[PDB]
Amino acid sequence: AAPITLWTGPGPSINGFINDTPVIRCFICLTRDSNLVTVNASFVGEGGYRIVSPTQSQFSLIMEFDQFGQLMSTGNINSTTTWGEKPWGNNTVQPRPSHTWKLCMPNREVYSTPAATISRCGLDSIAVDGAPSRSIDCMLIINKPKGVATYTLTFRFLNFNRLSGGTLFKTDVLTFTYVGENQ
Amino acid sequence: SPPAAPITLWTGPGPSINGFINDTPVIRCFICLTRDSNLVTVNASFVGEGGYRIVSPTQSQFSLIMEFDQFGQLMSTGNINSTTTWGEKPWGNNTVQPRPSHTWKLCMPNREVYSTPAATISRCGLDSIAVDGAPSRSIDCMLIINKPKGVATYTLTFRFLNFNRLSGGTLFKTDVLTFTYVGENQ
Amino acid sequence: PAAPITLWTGPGPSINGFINDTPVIRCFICLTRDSNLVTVNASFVGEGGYRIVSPTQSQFSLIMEFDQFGQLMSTGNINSTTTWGEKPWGNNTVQPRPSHTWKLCMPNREVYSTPAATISRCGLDSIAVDGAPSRSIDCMLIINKPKGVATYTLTFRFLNFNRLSGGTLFKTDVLTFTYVGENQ
Ligand SMILES: CC(=O)N[C@H]1[C@H]([C@H](O)[C@H](O)CO)O[C@@](O[C@@H]2[C@@H](O)[C@H](O)O[C@H](CO)[C@@H]2O)(C(=O)O)C[C@@H]1O
Ligand SMILES: CC(=O)N[C@H]1[C@H]([C@H](O)[C@H](O)CO)O[C@@](O)(C(=O)O)C[C@@H]1O
Ligand SMILES: CC(=O)N[C@H]1[C@H]([C@H](O)[C@H](O)CO)O[C@@](O)(C(=O)O)C[C@@H]1O
C-alpha cells in the first residue's frame, strides 16, 4: 500500500481540446493517499477562451481512463499531452504505466452511478480582488459514461451568465475529493 | 511507519436508509471519515427517501448528528448511528469491518482543538447532473464539529440549511460533500 | 517515499495576526503535508476592533512569509514572534526545532512560479446565526504572491464584507485550502 500522484506536471501545454482544437491549459493533479483521491486543478483559457463573456456556452473537459487507470487518447484532456506519475522529490512526469495507477481512479462500486460536486470557480481572482460577480462554477462529474472509458472525470464549466462582464479565464486552484479505487 | 497510521471509518457503498429523523428512516447516507497523517477528511453524500425524496423551498432545516464515544465508537443514539452498517474500510476492498479498534479514535475531531464547537458551512448542490448545476438548485450543508449531544465525547453534525434558496421542488440527491478537521491523538 | 509533516500554531493561539504592528486576530493555522499535497486548515477569531465586523469593513491580508527552508520569518502579519512549529503525531505540542522536512509544507515553487489563488466562502459565527447566507464573507488564499525577501508566502485575504447583512462576530468557520507541496 502506497500513495500515488498522477499529473500533467508544471507548466502544462495547451492540453484541453474542444473539437480537436487546443483552447485551455489544464494543470491537473490526482493524488491518492490512504483511501481518498484529491483532485487539484487550475485552468487558463487560450485564444478564443482567453476572455469569457457572460454569454459563454457551458462546456465539459472529460478525461477518459481505461480499467488500469491509464489516460486514454480520446477525451478533451488526453494522453497526447504530458501525463503520468509524479515521483516523490521531483517535478517530473513519468509516462510508464504501473498497476498502481488504478488507485487514482474513482472507486467503481462507490461510483456505480455518476456522482458530482459543483463548486465556485473564481476567475482572475487576484486582479479583480475576488469580486463576487467574477466567479463561475466548475462541476466535477465522476464516472459519467463516455465512449468505452472505464473511469471518467469531467470538469464542467457552468453559469458564465453569473459574470458581470468579460473576464479573463484564469481559474483559481480548484479542489475536489473522491473515494479511490481498490488495487 | 507513518503508513501504519491511516484509518477509514465508513458506511460502505450502497448504504441502507440509515439517516433517521424522529426514529423514522428518511435519508440514505454515504459517510466516509478518512484519517491520514494529521487531518481527517469527511466525504459524504445523501439521497432522500419517502417524504424526503423531494424537498421544497419551504423545507425546514435539519441536523443529522453522529455521536461517538471516547474510543471513536459510533453510538446507537444519533440520527446516523451504529444500528446500521458502520466500521473500518480495509485498504484494498470495499468491506465494512464492524469490530471496534482503539485506532478508531484517530478519525475523531481533536478534543483540544475543538474544545468548543466548530463549523464549516458549504454549498450543497442538489441533483446537479440532472439540473446542470443551476444556481437555484443548491442548498447549504454545515458540518458542526463537537456540538454537545447527550454524553457523546465527539459529534459530527450534517445540518442542511437554506432550502429557501431553491427555485422549486428538487430531488434531495446531494453532491459529494467534503469537509476537513484536525484528527484526535491516539 | 512520502514523508508527512505538520507545521502549526498549536491550539488556543494567542492574538498572533498583526495589522500595522497591532495584534488584532487569533489565527489557528495548520499546514499538513501528506504524500504530495499540503492541506491548509485554518480558523480565525477577531479581537478588539475586529471582534465584530460590519459590511463597511475594509478588506485585509494576513501574510505568512517563509524562507527557502520553510521557516516562518518575523516580518509577515503572522510571524515567528508567536507560537509556530511542528506538530508531533500523538500530541498537541508545538516543537520549534527546524528540520529539512519543514520545506515539504511549502508551496512548490515551480508549480506556483507565479501567484495562485483560491477564493472560498468564509462563514462567520455560523452556529449562532444558523448559517444565514448573509453571515458569510470570503477568504482567498494567495500562494506565493511576492513579499519582501520571502521565498514562499501564504496570504489569507479577507474580502467582501459587504456580503454581510450587519455586524457579525468575526468568528470564522474552519477553512480548508489545498496546494502542491515543495520537493525535498
Ligand atoms: C483593515 C485594513 O487596514 N485594510 C487595509 C489593508 C491592511 O492594512 C493589510 O492588508 C494588512 O496586511 O491594506 C490594504 O492595502 C494594501 C497595501 O497596504 C499594500 O502595500 O499593498 C497591498 C496590495 O499588494 C494592498 O494595497 C489592502 O490589503 O487592500 C488596504 C486596506 O484598506
Ligand atoms: C463551448 C462549447 O462548445 N459548448 C458546447 C459543449 C462543448 O462542445 C463540449 O462540452 C466540449 O466537450 O457541448 C455541449 O453539449 C455541452 O456540453 O453542453 C453544448 C455546448 O454548447
Ligand atoms: C425537518 C425537521 O424535522 N426539522 C426540525 C429539526 C429536526 O427534527 C432535527 O434537526 C433532526 O435531528 O429539528 C429542529 O430543532 C432544528 O434542527 O432546527 C427544528 C426543525 O424544524
Determine whether the shortest distance from the Cβ of C159 to ligand 1 is under 6 A. Answer: no
The 3-state DSSP class for residue A100 equals: helix
Alpha carbon distance C75, C66 (integer Å): 9
CA atoms B99, B97, C89, B147: torsion sign? negative
CA distance to partner chain B, nearest, from residue A25 (Å): 23
Alpha carbon distance A15, C91 (integer Å): 45
- Which residue is listed with cell 480548484? A174
Question: Chain C partners of B119 at a C-beta cutoff of 8 Å?
Answer: 123, 126-127, 131, 173-174
CA atoms C124, C125, C131, C132: torsion sign? negative
Cα-trace Rg, chain C: 16
The 3-state DSSP class for residue B136 equals: helix
Burial (CB < 10 A; 0-12, 13-18, 19+), residue A103, is buried
- Phi first, then psi: give them for residue C154, nearest 5 degrees: -125, 125
Determine whether the shortest distance from the Cβ of C77 to ligand 1 is under 6 A. Answer: yes
User: Which 70-99 residues of chain A touch chain C by CB within 8 A?
Assistant: 86, 88-91
- Which residue is listed with cell 457551458? A58
Experimental method: X-ray
Alpha carbon distance A1, A140 (integer Å): 27
Alpha carbon distance A28, A26 (integer Å): 6
Which CATH number describes the domain made up of B1-186? 2.60.90.10
- Resolution in angstroms comes to 1.9
- At the second CATH level, the architecture of A1-183 is Sandwich (2.60)
- Cβ–Cβ of A34/B8 closer than 8 Å? yes
Letter for the amino acid at C23? P
- Cβ–Cβ of A172/C118 closer than 8 Å? yes
Q: Which atom of ligand 2 is nearest to the CA of A76?
A: 12
Alpha carbon distance B144, B175 (integer Å): 18
CB C72 within 8 A of CB C65: yes
Residue from C88, C81, C86 nearest C97 by CA = C86
CB C43 within 8 A of CB C175: yes
Alpha carbon distance C46, C27 (integer Å): 9
Which chains form contacts with chain B, at 3 or more CB pairs under 8 Å? A, C
The 3-state DSSP class for residue B138 equals: strand
Nearest to C4 among B37, B140, B147 (CB): B37
Largest CA distance in chain C: 50
Alpha carbon distance B34, A35 (integer Å): 7
Domain boundaries, chain B: 1-186
Alpha carbon distance B28, B14 (integer Å): 8
Alpha carbon distance C19, C50 (integer Å): 11
The 3-state DSSP class for residue B91 equals: coil
Name every residue whose Cβ is closer than 8 Å to that of residue B151 and which is 6 or more positions away in sequence: none
- Cβ–Cβ of B162/C87 closer than 8 Å? no
Nearest to A117 among B14, B32, B176 (CB): B176
Three cell numbers at A41? 486543478
CB B173 within 8 A of CB A115: no
Alpha carbon distance C43, B104 (integer Å): 25
Alpha carbon distance A61, A75 (integer Å): 7
Residue from B104, B128, B140, B110 nearest B39 by CA = B110
Question: Chain B partners of C83 at a C-beta cutoff of 8 Å?
Answer: none
Taking the CA atoms of residue C172, residue C176, residue C180 and residue C184 in that order, the dihedral angle to the nearest 10 degrees is 80
Nearest to C126 among B142, B165, B181 (CB): B142
Letter for the amino acid at A119? S
Residue B88: closest CA among chain A residues belongs to which residue?
A: A35
Burial (CB < 10 A; 0-12, 13-18, 19+), residue A120, is buried
Residues with CB under 6 A from ligand 3: B 21, 60-63, 79
Determine whether the shortest distance from the Cβ of A179 to ligand 2 is under 6 A. Answer: no
Alpha carbon distance A51, A45 (integer Å): 7
- Phi first, then psi: give them for residue A52, nearest 5 degrees: -110, 145
C55 dihedral zone (left: phi>0; alpha: psi -120 to 50; beta): alpha
Name every residue whose Cβ is closer than 8 Å to that of residue B161 and which is 6 or more positions away in sequence: B61, B121, B139, B140, B141, B142, C130, C131
Nearest to C117 among A11, A90, A126 (CB): A126
The 3-state DSSP class for residue B56 equals: coil
- Which residue is listed with cell 476567475? A123
Q: What angle do CA B158, B162, B167 make, to 5 degrees?
A: 130
Alpha helices in A20-62 (DSSP H): none
Burial (CB < 10 A; 0-12, 13-18, 19+), residue C105, is buried
Three cell numbers at C171? 468568528
Residue from B43, B110, B36, B35 nearest B70 by CA = B110
CA C184 to chain CA centroid, nearest Å:
22
CB B102 within 8 A of CB B184: no
Three cell numbers at C85? 512549529
Strand partners, C5: C33
Question: Chain A partners of C103 at a C-beta cutoff of 8 Å?
Answer: none
Whether A35 and chain B come into contact, CB under 8 Å, resolves to: yes
Whether B30 and chain A come into contact, CB under 8 Å, resolves to: yes
User: What letter would DSSP give residue A54?
Assistant: T
Alpha carbon distance C113, C49 (integer Å): 36
Whether B16 and chain C come into contact, CB under 8 Å, resolves to: no
Three cell numbers at A71? 489516460
CB A165 within 8 A of CB A92: no
CB A35 within 8 A of CB A44: no
A164 dihedral zone (left: phi>0; alpha: psi -120 to 50; beta): alpha
The 3-state DSSP class for residue C39 equals: strand
Alpha carbon distance B154, B70 (integer Å): 7
Question: Chain A partners of B176 at a C-beta cutoff of 8 Å?
Answer: 115-117, 142, 176-178
The 3-state DSSP class for residue B42 equals: strand
Strand partners, B30: B45
Alpha carbon distance A61, A15 (integer Å): 10
Residue from C13, C175, C18 nearest C94 by CA = C13
Whether A156 and chain B come into contact, CB under 8 Å, resolves to: yes
Residue from C110, C29, C38, C103 nearest C70 by CA = C103
Mutate to test the pocket of ligand 1, among C53, C54, C56, C61 (most ligand atoms within 8 A of CB): C61
C-beta pairs of A47-50 under 8 Å, 24+ apart in sequence: A47/A23, A48/A23, A49/A23, A49/A24, A49/A169, A50/A168, A50/A169
- Cβ–Cβ of A120/C121 closer than 8 Å? yes
Strand partners, A73: none
Alpha carbon distance B119, C130 (integer Å): 10
The 3-state DSSP class for residue B156 equals: strand
Alpha carbon distance A182, C105 (integer Å): 28
Nearest to A130 among C108, C160, C180 (CB): C160
User: Which 44-73 residues of chain A touch chain C by CB within 8 A?
Assistant: none
Strand partners, A51: A168
Q: How far is CA A174 from CA A121, B173, C174, C178, in A?
A: 7, 23, 18, 8
Which CATH number describes the domain made up of C1-184? 2.60.90.10
- Cβ–Cβ of A125/C119 closer than 8 Å? yes
Question: Chain B partners of C126 at a C-beta cutoff of 8 Å?
Answer: 119-121, 142
Cα-trace Rg, chain A: 16
For chain C, the residue count is 184
Alpha carbon distance B82, B156 (integer Å): 14
Residue from B94, B87, B57 nearest B72 by CA = B87
CB A72 within 8 A of CB A65: yes
Question: Chain C partners of A5 at a C-beta cutoff of 8 Å?
Answer: 35-36
Q: How far is CA C41 from CA A105, A108, C71, in A?
A: 26, 30, 18
Three cell numbers at B66? 453522529
Alpha carbon distance C27, C11 (integer Å): 10
Name every residue whose Cβ is closer than 8 Å to that of residue C22 and which is 6 or more positions away in sequence: none
